[PDB]
PDB file of all heavy atoms in Angstrom:
ATOM      1  N   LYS A 277     -29.063 -23.944  28.773  1.00  0.00           N
ATOM      2  CA  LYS A 277     -29.865 -24.624  27.768  1.00  0.00           C
ATOM      3  C   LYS A 277     -28.989 -24.918  26.558  1.00  0.00           C
ATOM      4  O   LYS A 277     -28.271 -24.054  26.073  1.00  0.00           O
ATOM      5  CB  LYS A 277     -31.067 -23.755  27.349  1.00  0.00           C
ATOM      6  CG  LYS A 277     -31.764 -24.279  26.117  1.00  0.00           C
ATOM      7  CD  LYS A 277     -33.178 -23.765  26.016  1.00  0.00           C
ATOM      8  CE  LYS A 277     -33.946 -24.511  24.933  1.00  0.00           C
ATOM      9  NZ  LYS A 277     -35.276 -23.909  24.681  1.00  0.00           N
ATOM     10  N   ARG A 278     -29.038 -26.169  26.085  1.00  0.00           N
ATOM     11  CA  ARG A 278     -28.225 -26.568  24.964  1.00  0.00           C
ATOM     12  C   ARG A 278     -28.671 -25.827  23.700  1.00  0.00           C
ATOM     13  O   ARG A 278     -29.863 -25.833  23.390  1.00  0.00           O
ATOM     14  CB  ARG A 278     -28.289 -28.068  24.756  1.00  0.00           C
ATOM     15  CG  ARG A 278     -27.150 -28.629  23.926  1.00  0.00           C
ATOM     16  CD  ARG A 278     -27.369 -30.080  23.607  1.00  0.00           C
ATOM     17  NE  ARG A 278     -27.262 -30.928  24.772  1.00  0.00           N
ATOM     18  CZ  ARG A 278     -26.184 -31.638  25.063  1.00  0.00           C
ATOM     19  NH1 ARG A 278     -25.095 -31.618  24.295  1.00  0.00           N
ATOM     20  NH2 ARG A 278     -26.171 -32.393  26.167  1.00  0.00           N
ATOM     21  N   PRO A 279     -27.766 -25.212  22.954  1.00  0.00           N
ATOM     22  CA  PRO A 279     -28.166 -24.430  21.768  1.00  0.00           C
ATOM     23  C   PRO A 279     -28.336 -25.287  20.528  1.00  0.00           C
ATOM     24  O   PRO A 279     -27.476 -25.333  19.624  1.00  0.00           O
ATOM     25  CB  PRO A 279     -27.018 -23.424  21.647  1.00  0.00           C
ATOM     26  CG  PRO A 279     -25.829 -24.146  22.172  1.00  0.00           C
ATOM     27  CD  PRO A 279     -26.327 -25.134  23.212  1.00  0.00           C
ATOM     28  N   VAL A 280     -29.434 -26.012  20.453  1.00  0.00           N
ATOM     29  CA  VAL A 280     -29.757 -26.859  19.315  1.00  0.00           C
ATOM     30  C   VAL A 280     -31.100 -26.420  18.751  1.00  0.00           C
ATOM     31  O   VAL A 280     -32.000 -26.035  19.530  1.00  0.00           O
ATOM     32  CB  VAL A 280     -29.751 -28.329  19.687  1.00  0.00           C
ATOM     33  CG1 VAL A 280     -28.331 -28.841  19.854  1.00  0.00           C
ATOM     34  CG2 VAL A 280     -30.532 -28.545  20.961  1.00  0.00           C
ATOM     35  N   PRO A 281     -31.301 -26.445  17.442  1.00  0.00           N
ATOM     36  CA  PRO A 281     -32.566 -25.999  16.860  1.00  0.00           C
ATOM     37  C   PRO A 281     -33.704 -26.939  17.224  1.00  0.00           C
ATOM     38  O   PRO A 281     -33.612 -28.142  17.014  1.00  0.00           O
ATOM     39  CB  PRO A 281     -32.314 -25.991  15.361  1.00  0.00           C
ATOM     40  CG  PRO A 281     -30.818 -25.920  15.218  1.00  0.00           C
ATOM     41  CD  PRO A 281     -30.296 -26.701  16.386  1.00  0.00           C
ATOM     42  N   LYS A 282     -34.778 -26.365  17.798  1.00  0.00           N
ATOM     43  CA  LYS A 282     -36.001 -27.101  18.142  1.00  0.00           C
ATOM     44  C   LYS A 282     -35.753 -28.218  19.126  1.00  0.00           C
ATOM     45  O   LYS A 282     -36.484 -29.205  19.177  1.00  0.00           O
ATOM     46  CB  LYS A 282     -36.700 -27.626  16.898  1.00  0.00           C
ATOM     47  CG  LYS A 282     -37.384 -26.554  16.064  1.00  0.00           C
ATOM     48  CD  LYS A 282     -37.204 -26.808  14.583  1.00  0.00           C
ATOM     49  CE  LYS A 282     -38.230 -26.039  13.785  1.00  0.00           C
ATOM     50  NZ  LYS A 282     -37.920 -26.030  12.345  1.00  0.00           N
ATOM     51  N   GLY A 283     -34.687 -28.102  19.926  1.00  0.00           N
ATOM     52  CA  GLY A 283     -34.366 -29.133  20.893  1.00  0.00           C
ATOM     53  C   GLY A 283     -33.918 -30.437  20.298  1.00  0.00           C
ATOM     54  O   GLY A 283     -33.944 -31.472  20.979  1.00  0.00           O
ATOM     55  N   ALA A 284     -33.521 -30.446  19.025  1.00  0.00           N
ATOM     56  CA  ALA A 284     -33.161 -31.680  18.326  1.00  0.00           C
ATOM     57  C   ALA A 284     -31.665 -31.908  18.499  1.00  0.00           C
ATOM     58  O   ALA A 284     -30.843 -31.158  17.958  1.00  0.00           O
ATOM     59  CB  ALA A 284     -33.538 -31.593  16.856  1.00  0.00           C
ATOM     60  N   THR A 285     -31.303 -32.931  19.246  1.00  0.00           N
ATOM     61  CA  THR A 285     -29.928 -33.374  19.399  1.00  0.00           C
ATOM     62  C   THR A 285     -29.837 -34.740  18.737  1.00  0.00           C
ATOM     63  O   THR A 285     -30.098 -35.767  19.341  1.00  0.00           O
ATOM     64  CB  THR A 285     -29.537 -33.438  20.873  1.00  0.00           C
ATOM     65  OG1 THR A 285     -30.497 -34.203  21.597  1.00  0.00           O
ATOM     66  CG2 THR A 285     -29.494 -32.059  21.451  1.00  0.00           C
ATOM     67  N   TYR A 286     -29.483 -34.734  17.462  1.00  0.00           N
ATOM     68  CA  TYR A 286     -29.477 -35.934  16.643  1.00  0.00           C
ATOM     69  C   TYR A 286     -28.407 -36.881  17.143  1.00  0.00           C
ATOM     70  O   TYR A 286     -27.219 -36.664  16.944  1.00  0.00           O
ATOM     71  CB  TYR A 286     -29.245 -35.580  15.164  1.00  0.00           C
ATOM     72  CG  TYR A 286     -30.130 -34.486  14.681  1.00  0.00           C
ATOM     73  CD1 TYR A 286     -29.713 -33.150  14.681  1.00  0.00           C
ATOM     74  CD2 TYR A 286     -31.410 -34.753  14.181  1.00  0.00           C
ATOM     75  CE1 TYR A 286     -30.529 -32.149  14.237  1.00  0.00           C
ATOM     76  CE2 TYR A 286     -32.223 -33.758  13.729  1.00  0.00           C
ATOM     77  CZ  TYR A 286     -31.769 -32.459  13.753  1.00  0.00           C
ATOM     78  OH  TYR A 286     -32.596 -31.450  13.296  1.00  0.00           O
ATOM     79  N   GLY A 287     -28.834 -37.952  17.819  1.00  0.00           N
ATOM     80  CA  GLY A 287     -27.879 -38.898  18.379  1.00  0.00           C
ATOM     81  C   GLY A 287     -28.598 -39.850  19.320  1.00  0.00           C
ATOM     82  O   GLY A 287     -29.832 -39.942  19.325  1.00  0.00           O
ATOM     83  N   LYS A 288     -27.795 -40.553  20.112  1.00  0.00           N
ATOM     84  CA  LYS A 288     -28.323 -41.558  21.016  1.00  0.00           C
ATOM     85  C   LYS A 288     -29.106 -40.893  22.153  1.00  0.00           C
ATOM     86  O   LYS A 288     -28.859 -39.732  22.482  1.00  0.00           O
ATOM     87  CB  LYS A 288     -27.205 -42.411  21.550  1.00  0.00           C
ATOM     88  CG  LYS A 288     -26.303 -42.925  20.442  1.00  0.00           C
ATOM     89  CD  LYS A 288     -25.476 -44.105  20.869  1.00  0.00           C
ATOM     90  CE  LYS A 288     -24.500 -44.484  19.768  1.00  0.00           C
ATOM     91  NZ  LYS A 288     -23.960 -45.852  19.925  1.00  0.00           N
ATOM     92  N   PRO A 289     -30.076 -41.604  22.742  1.00  0.00           N
ATOM     93  CA  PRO A 289     -30.940 -40.978  23.754  1.00  0.00           C
ATOM     94  C   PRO A 289     -30.216 -40.465  24.980  1.00  0.00           C
ATOM     95  O   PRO A 289     -30.776 -39.623  25.691  1.00  0.00           O
ATOM     96  CB  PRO A 289     -31.916 -42.109  24.124  1.00  0.00           C
ATOM     97  CG  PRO A 289     -31.962 -42.952  22.913  1.00  0.00           C
ATOM     98  CD  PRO A 289     -30.591 -42.914  22.319  1.00  0.00           C
ATOM     99  N   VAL A 290     -28.995 -40.918  25.271  1.00  0.00           N
ATOM    100  CA  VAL A 290     -28.268 -40.396  26.421  1.00  0.00           C
ATOM    101  C   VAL A 290     -27.891 -38.948  26.211  1.00  0.00           C
ATOM    102  O   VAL A 290     -27.584 -38.234  27.199  1.00  0.00           O
ATOM    103  CB  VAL A 290     -27.036 -41.289  26.705  1.00  0.00           C
ATOM    104  CG1 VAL A 290     -25.908 -41.000  25.713  1.00  0.00           C
ATOM    105  CG2 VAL A 290     -26.557 -41.102  28.131  1.00  0.00           C
ATOM    106  N   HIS A 291     -27.874 -38.465  24.984  1.00  0.00           N
ATOM    107  CA  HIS A 291     -27.540 -37.087  24.664  1.00  0.00           C
ATOM    108  C   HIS A 291     -28.752 -36.286  24.209  1.00  0.00           C
ATOM    109  O   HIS A 291     -28.602 -35.214  23.615  1.00  0.00           O
ATOM    110  CB  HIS A 291     -26.446 -37.042  23.598  1.00  0.00           C
ATOM    111  CG  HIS A 291     -25.205 -37.784  23.965  1.00  0.00           C
ATOM    112  ND1 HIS A 291     -24.664 -38.762  23.177  1.00  0.00           N
ATOM    113  CD2 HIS A 291     -24.409 -37.683  25.058  1.00  0.00           C
ATOM    114  CE1 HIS A 291     -23.585 -39.254  23.747  1.00  0.00           C
ATOM    115  NE2 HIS A 291     -23.400 -38.591  24.898  1.00  0.00           N
ATOM    116  N   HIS A 292     -29.968 -36.774  24.505  1.00  0.00           N
ATOM    117  CA  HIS A 292     -31.171 -36.056  24.132  1.00  0.00           C
ATOM    118  C   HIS A 292     -31.511 -34.923  25.081  1.00  0.00           C
ATOM    119  O   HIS A 292     -32.467 -34.174  24.823  1.00  0.00           O
ATOM    120  CB  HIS A 292     -32.346 -37.013  24.065  1.00  0.00           C
ATOM    121  CG  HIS A 292     -32.416 -37.774  22.772  1.00  0.00           C
ATOM    122  ND1 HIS A 292     -33.408 -38.706  22.514  1.00  0.00           N
ATOM    123  CD2 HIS A 292     -31.629 -37.747  21.678  1.00  0.00           C
ATOM    124  CE1 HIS A 292     -33.213 -39.224  21.309  1.00  0.00           C
ATOM    125  NE2 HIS A 292     -32.144 -38.671  20.780  1.00  0.00           N
ATOM    126  N   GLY A 293     -30.767 -34.772  26.172  1.00  0.00           N
ATOM    127  CA  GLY A 293     -31.023 -33.705  27.122  1.00  0.00           C
ATOM    128  C   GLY A 293     -30.858 -32.331  26.540  1.00  0.00           C
ATOM    129  O   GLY A 293     -29.868 -32.041  25.858  1.00  0.00           O
ATOM    130  N   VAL A 294     -31.838 -31.459  26.774  1.00  0.00           N
ATOM    131  CA  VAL A 294     -31.802 -30.085  26.340  1.00  0.00           C
ATOM    132  C   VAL A 294     -31.912 -29.119  27.519  1.00  0.00           C
ATOM    133  O   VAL A 294     -31.142 -28.177  27.651  1.00  0.00           O
ATOM    134  CB  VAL A 294     -32.911 -29.781  25.293  1.00  0.00           C
ATOM    135  CG1 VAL A 294     -33.003 -28.290  25.036  1.00  0.00           C
ATOM    136  CG2 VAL A 294     -32.649 -30.529  24.023  1.00  0.00           C
ATOM    137  N   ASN A 295     -32.864 -29.382  28.419  1.00  0.00           N
ATOM    138  CA  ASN A 295     -32.993 -28.622  29.655  1.00  0.00           C
ATOM    139  C   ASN A 295     -32.278 -29.368  30.756  1.00  0.00           C
ATOM    140  O   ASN A 295     -31.700 -30.442  30.548  1.00  0.00           O
ATOM    141  CB  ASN A 295     -34.464 -28.393  29.992  1.00  0.00           C
ATOM    142  CG  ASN A 295     -35.131 -27.406  29.073  1.00  0.00           C
ATOM    143  OD1 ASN A 295     -34.760 -26.221  29.054  1.00  0.00           O
ATOM    144  ND2 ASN A 295     -36.127 -27.863  28.319  1.00  0.00           N
ATOM    145  N   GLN A 296     -32.317 -28.788  31.959  1.00  0.00           N
ATOM    146  CA  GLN A 296     -31.694 -29.345  33.163  1.00  0.00           C
ATOM    147  C   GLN A 296     -30.208 -29.605  32.982  1.00  0.00           C
ATOM    148  O   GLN A 296     -29.622 -30.426  33.696  1.00  0.00           O
ATOM    149  CB  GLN A 296     -32.405 -30.628  33.601  1.00  0.00           C
ATOM    150  CG  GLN A 296     -33.919 -30.540  33.623  1.00  0.00           C
ATOM    151  CD  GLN A 296     -34.518 -31.332  34.745  1.00  0.00           C
ATOM    152  OE1 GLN A 296     -33.898 -32.250  35.270  1.00  0.00           O
ATOM    153  NE2 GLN A 296     -35.742 -30.996  35.115  1.00  0.00           N
ATOM    154  N   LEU A 297     -29.562 -28.920  32.050  1.00  0.00           N
ATOM    155  CA  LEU A 297     -28.118 -29.027  31.837  1.00  0.00           C
ATOM    156  C   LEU A 297     -27.433 -27.874  32.542  1.00  0.00           C
ATOM    157  O   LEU A 297     -28.000 -26.785  32.672  1.00  0.00           O
ATOM    158  CB  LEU A 297     -27.778 -29.018  30.334  1.00  0.00           C
ATOM    159  CG  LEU A 297     -28.411 -30.121  29.488  1.00  0.00           C
ATOM    160  CD1 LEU A 297     -27.811 -30.131  28.116  1.00  0.00           C
ATOM    161  CD2 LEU A 297     -28.240 -31.470  30.155  1.00  0.00           C
ATOM    162  N   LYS A 298     -26.214 -28.118  32.991  1.00  0.00           N
ATOM    163  CA  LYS A 298     -25.498 -27.160  33.820  1.00  0.00           C
ATOM    164  C   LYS A 298     -24.148 -26.855  33.228  1.00  0.00           C
ATOM    165  O   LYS A 298     -23.408 -27.739  32.787  1.00  0.00           O
ATOM    166  CB  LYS A 298     -25.357 -27.694  35.244  1.00  0.00           C
ATOM    167  CG  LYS A 298     -26.593 -27.495  36.083  1.00  0.00           C
ATOM    168  CD  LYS A 298     -27.454 -28.725  36.094  1.00  0.00           C
ATOM    169  CE  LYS A 298     -28.814 -28.429  36.674  1.00  0.00           C
ATOM    170  NZ  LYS A 298     -29.736 -29.577  36.520  1.00  0.00           N
ATOM    171  N   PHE A 299     -23.800 -25.569  33.245  1.00  0.00           N
ATOM    172  CA  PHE A 299     -22.500 -25.125  32.765  1.00  0.00           C
ATOM    173  C   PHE A 299     -21.417 -25.589  33.725  1.00  0.00           C
ATOM    174  O   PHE A 299     -21.610 -25.633  34.943  1.00  0.00           O
ATOM    175  CB  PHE A 299     -22.494 -23.590  32.652  1.00  0.00           C
ATOM    176  CG  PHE A 299     -21.290 -23.038  31.947  1.00  0.00           C
ATOM    177  CD1 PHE A 299     -20.676 -23.746  30.955  1.00  0.00           C
ATOM    178  CD2 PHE A 299     -20.816 -21.777  32.294  1.00  0.00           C
ATOM    179  CE1 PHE A 299     -19.583 -23.218  30.287  1.00  0.00           C
ATOM    180  CE2 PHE A 299     -19.733 -21.252  31.631  1.00  0.00           C
ATOM    181  CZ  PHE A 299     -19.106 -21.974  30.641  1.00  0.00           C
ATOM    182  N   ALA A 300     -20.237 -25.943  33.167  1.00  0.00           N
ATOM    183  CA  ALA A 300     -19.145 -26.414  33.979  1.00  0.00           C
ATOM    184  C   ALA A 300     -18.495 -25.322  34.823  1.00  0.00           C
ATOM    185  O   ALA A 300     -17.741 -25.649  35.757  1.00  0.00           O
ATOM    186  CB  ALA A 300     -18.081 -27.062  33.107  1.00  0.00           C
ATOM    187  N   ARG A 301     -18.755 -24.054  34.532  1.00  0.00           N
ATOM    188  CA  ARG A 301     -18.162 -22.953  35.248  1.00  0.00           C
ATOM    189  C   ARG A 301     -19.263 -22.123  35.917  1.00  0.00           C
ATOM    190  O   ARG A 301     -20.364 -22.023  35.399  1.00  0.00           O
ATOM    191  CB  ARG A 301     -17.307 -22.073  34.349  1.00  0.00           C
ATOM    192  CG  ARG A 301     -16.240 -22.852  33.588  1.00  0.00           C
ATOM    193  CD  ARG A 301     -15.619 -22.041  32.486  1.00  0.00           C
ATOM    194  NE  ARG A 301     -15.468 -20.644  32.868  1.00  0.00           N
ATOM    195  CZ  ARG A 301     -15.819 -19.611  32.105  1.00  0.00           C
ATOM    196  NH1 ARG A 301     -16.364 -19.796  30.916  1.00  0.00           N
ATOM    197  NH2 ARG A 301     -15.635 -18.373  32.550  1.00  0.00           N
ATOM    198  N   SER A 302     -18.929 -21.547  37.059  1.00  0.00           N
ATOM    199  CA  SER A 302     -19.902 -20.820  37.869  1.00  0.00           C
ATOM    200  C   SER A 302     -20.268 -19.488  37.207  1.00  0.00           C
ATOM    201  O   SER A 302     -19.592 -19.012  36.296  1.00  0.00           O
ATOM    202  CB  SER A 302     -19.363 -20.589  39.264  1.00  0.00           C
ATOM    203  OG  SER A 302     -18.273 -19.706  39.251  1.00  0.00           O
ATOM    204  N   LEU A 303     -21.343 -18.896  37.703  1.00  0.00           N
ATOM    205  CA  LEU A 303     -21.759 -17.598  37.216  1.00  0.00           C
ATOM    206  C   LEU A 303     -20.784 -16.504  37.598  1.00  0.00           C
ATOM    207  O   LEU A 303     -20.661 -15.508  36.897  1.00  0.00           O
ATOM    208  CB  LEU A 303     -23.159 -17.248  37.726  1.00  0.00           C
ATOM    209  CG  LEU A 303     -24.323 -18.113  37.230  1.00  0.00           C
ATOM    210  CD1 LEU A 303     -25.560 -17.847  38.056  1.00  0.00           C
ATOM    211  CD2 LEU A 303     -24.573 -17.845  35.760  1.00  0.00           C
ATOM    212  N   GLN A 304     -20.089 -16.666  38.725  1.00  0.00           N
ATOM    213  CA  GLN A 304     -19.047 -15.720  39.104  1.00  0.00           C
ATOM    214  C   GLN A 304     -17.883 -15.761  38.105  1.00  0.00           C
ATOM    215  O   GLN A 304     -17.318 -14.722  37.777  1.00  0.00           O
ATOM    216  CB  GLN A 304     -18.550 -16.007  40.510  1.00  0.00           C
ATOM    217  CG  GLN A 304     -17.578 -14.990  41.028  1.00  0.00           C
ATOM    218  CD  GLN A 304     -17.248 -15.185  42.498  1.00  0.00           C
ATOM    219  OE1 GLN A 304     -18.005 -15.810  43.228  1.00  0.00           O
ATOM    220  NE2 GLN A 304     -16.121 -14.625  42.918  1.00  0.00           N
ATOM    221  N   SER A 305     -17.542 -16.956  37.636  1.00  0.00           N
ATOM    222  CA  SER A 305     -16.499 -17.065  36.609  1.00  0.00           C
ATOM    223  C   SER A 305     -16.931 -16.468  35.297  1.00  0.00           C
ATOM    224  O   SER A 305     -16.109 -15.934  34.532  1.00  0.00           O
ATOM    225  CB  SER A 305     -16.104 -18.542  36.449  1.00  0.00           C
ATOM    226  OG  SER A 305     -14.898 -18.660  35.708  1.00  0.00           O
ATOM    227  N   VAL A 306     -18.228 -16.540  34.992  1.00  0.00           N
ATOM    228  CA  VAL A 306     -18.728 -15.939  33.759  1.00  0.00           C
ATOM    229  C   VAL A 306     -18.676 -14.421  33.853  1.00  0.00           C
ATOM    230  O   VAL A 306     -18.306 -13.728  32.888  1.00  0.00           O
ATOM    231  CB  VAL A 306     -20.172 -16.430  33.475  1.00  0.00           C
ATOM    232  CG1 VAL A 306     -20.767 -15.695  32.289  1.00  0.00           C
ATOM    233  CG2 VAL A 306     -20.161 -17.919  33.212  1.00  0.00           C
ATOM    234  N   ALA A 307     -19.020 -13.870  35.035  1.00  0.00           N
ATOM    235  CA  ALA A 307     -18.971 -12.433  35.223  1.00  0.00           C
ATOM    236  C   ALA A 307     -17.539 -11.912  35.103  1.00  0.00           C
ATOM    237  O   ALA A 307     -17.318 -10.836  34.527  1.00  0.00           O
ATOM    238  CB  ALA A 307     -19.565 -12.054  36.569  1.00  0.00           C
ATOM    239  N   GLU A 308     -16.559 -12.631  35.672  1.00  0.00           N
ATOM    240  CA  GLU A 308     -15.188 -12.229  35.549  1.00  0.00           C
ATOM    241  C   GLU A 308     -14.722 -12.283  34.101  1.00  0.00           C
ATOM    242  O   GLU A 308     -13.925 -11.445  33.660  1.00  0.00           O
ATOM    243  CB  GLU A 308     -14.291 -13.123  36.405  1.00  0.00           C
ATOM    244  CG  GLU A 308     -14.512 -12.979  37.896  1.00  0.00           C
ATOM    245  CD  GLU A 308     -13.702 -13.983  38.698  1.00  0.00           C
ATOM    246  OE1 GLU A 308     -13.312 -15.013  38.117  1.00  0.00           O
ATOM    247  OE2 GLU A 308     -13.435 -13.729  39.889  1.00  0.00           O
ATOM    248  N   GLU A 309     -15.199 -13.273  33.345  1.00  0.00           N
ATOM    249  CA  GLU A 309     -14.820 -13.391  31.941  1.00  0.00           C
ATOM    250  C   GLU A 309     -15.345 -12.206  31.137  1.00  0.00           C
ATOM    251  O   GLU A 309     -14.655 -11.686  30.244  1.00  0.00           O
ATOM    252  CB  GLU A 309     -15.352 -14.697  31.371  1.00  0.00           C
ATOM    253  CG  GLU A 309     -14.797 -15.034  30.015  1.00  0.00           C
ATOM    254  CD  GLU A 309     -15.614 -16.129  29.331  1.00  0.00           C
ATOM    255  OE1 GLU A 309     -16.548 -16.660  29.956  1.00  0.00           O
ATOM    256  OE2 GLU A 309     -15.308 -16.456  28.158  1.00  0.00           O
ATOM    257  N   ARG A 310     -16.569 -11.765  31.422  1.00  0.00           N
ATOM    258  CA  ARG A 310     -17.155 -10.657  30.670  1.00  0.00           C
ATOM    259  C   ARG A 310     -16.489  -9.316  31.029  1.00  0.00           C
ATOM    260  O   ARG A 310     -16.354  -8.442  30.198  1.00  0.00           O
ATOM    261  CB  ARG A 310     -18.648 -10.577  30.883  1.00  0.00           C
ATOM    262  CG  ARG A 310     -19.381 -11.642  30.091  1.00  0.00           C
ATOM    263  CD  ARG A 310     -20.830 -11.794  30.500  1.00  0.00           C
ATOM    264  NE  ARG A 310     -21.440 -12.933  29.826  1.00  0.00           N
ATOM    265  CZ  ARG A 310     -22.606 -13.444  30.151  1.00  0.00           C
ATOM    266  NH1 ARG A 310     -23.333 -12.954  31.126  1.00  0.00           N
ATOM    267  NH2 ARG A 310     -23.055 -14.497  29.462  1.00  0.00           N
ATOM    268  N   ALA A 311     -16.076  -9.181  32.284  1.00  0.00           N
ATOM    269  CA  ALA A 311     -15.343  -7.976  32.699  1.00  0.00           C
ATOM    270  C   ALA A 311     -13.976  -7.929  32.027  1.00  0.00           C
ATOM    271  O   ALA A 311     -13.538  -6.885  31.555  1.00  0.00           O
ATOM    272  CB  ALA A 311     -15.215  -7.921  34.210  1.00  0.00           C
ATOM    273  N   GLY A 312     -13.288  -9.084  32.015  1.00  0.00           N
ATOM    274  CA  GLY A 312     -11.958  -9.108  31.423  1.00  0.00           C
ATOM    275  C   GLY A 312     -11.988  -8.936  29.911  1.00  0.00           C
ATOM    276  O   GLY A 312     -11.103  -8.291  29.340  1.00  0.00           O
ATOM    277  N   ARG A 313     -12.972  -9.537  29.246  1.00  0.00           N
ATOM    278  CA  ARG A 313     -13.050  -9.440  27.790  1.00  0.00           C
ATOM    279  C   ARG A 313     -13.333  -8.008  27.351  1.00  0.00           C
ATOM    280  O   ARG A 313     -12.784  -7.523  26.364  1.00  0.00           O
ATOM    281  CB  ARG A 313     -14.132 -10.365  27.247  1.00  0.00           C
ATOM    282  CG  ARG A 313     -14.030 -10.621  25.760  1.00  0.00           C
ATOM    283  CD  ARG A 313     -15.007 -11.702  25.329  1.00  0.00           C
ATOM    284  NE  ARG A 313     -14.684 -12.985  25.950  1.00  0.00           N
ATOM    285  CZ  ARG A 313     -13.782 -13.833  25.493  1.00  0.00           C
ATOM    286  NH1 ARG A 313     -13.066 -13.578  24.426  1.00  0.00           N
ATOM    287  NH2 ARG A 313     -13.591 -14.980  26.151  1.00  0.00           N
ATOM    288  N   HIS A 314     -14.202  -7.302  28.079  1.00  0.00           N
ATOM    289  CA  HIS A 314     -14.491  -5.925  27.767  1.00  0.00           C
ATOM    290  C   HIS A 314     -13.269  -5.036  27.979  1.00  0.00           C
ATOM    291  O   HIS A 314     -12.872  -4.266  27.102  1.00  0.00           O
ATOM    292  CB  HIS A 314     -15.658  -5.416  28.623  1.00  0.00           C
ATOM    293  CG  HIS A 314     -16.094  -4.026  28.281  1.00  0.00           C
ATOM    294  ND1 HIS A 314     -15.728  -2.927  29.055  1.00  0.00           N
ATOM    295  CD2 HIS A 314     -16.854  -3.529  27.288  1.00  0.00           C
ATOM    296  CE1 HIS A 314     -16.252  -1.844  28.537  1.00  0.00           C
ATOM    297  NE2 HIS A 314     -16.936  -2.170  27.459  1.00  0.00           N
ATOM    298  N   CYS A 315     -12.625  -5.167  29.136  1.00  0.00           N
ATOM    299  CA  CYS A 315     -11.405  -4.421  29.440  1.00  0.00           C
ATOM    300  C   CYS A 315     -10.203  -5.328  29.205  1.00  0.00           C
ATOM    301  O   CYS A 315      -9.584  -5.849  30.139  1.00  0.00           O
ATOM    302  CB  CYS A 315     -11.448  -3.886  30.852  1.00  0.00           C
ATOM    303  SG  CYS A 315     -13.016  -3.068  31.296  1.00  0.00           S
ATOM    304  N   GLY A 316      -9.862  -5.495  27.932  1.00  0.00           N
ATOM    305  CA  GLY A 316      -8.727  -6.338  27.580  1.00  0.00           C
ATOM    306  C   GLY A 316      -7.394  -5.755  27.968  1.00  0.00           C
ATOM    307  O   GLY A 316      -6.402  -6.506  27.993  1.00  0.00           O
TER     308      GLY A 316
END
């Protein structure tokens, strides 16, 4: 979910999306990042 207050993305309608957005990296990559950051 895009972190904008009240779903307001001030700009052209092509960037009005708030939901249905997808992270460029997988959840497995996120889990590895959190493991590595904790155990630096």
Side-chain angles (χ1 to χ4, degrees):
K277 167 159 192 188
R278 199 188 290 260
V280 285
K282 287 141 162 168
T285 52
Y286 310 94
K288 310 199 186 198
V290 77
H291 303 126
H292 279 179
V294 171
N295 289 296
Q296 313 215 339
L297 301 190
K298 279 95 192 172
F299 191 31
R301 305 167 38 227
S302 67
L303 293 168
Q304 186 172 340
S305 193
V306 174
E308 293 175 338
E309 191 196 356
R310 284 169 187 167
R313 196 172 297 277
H314 184 259
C315 314

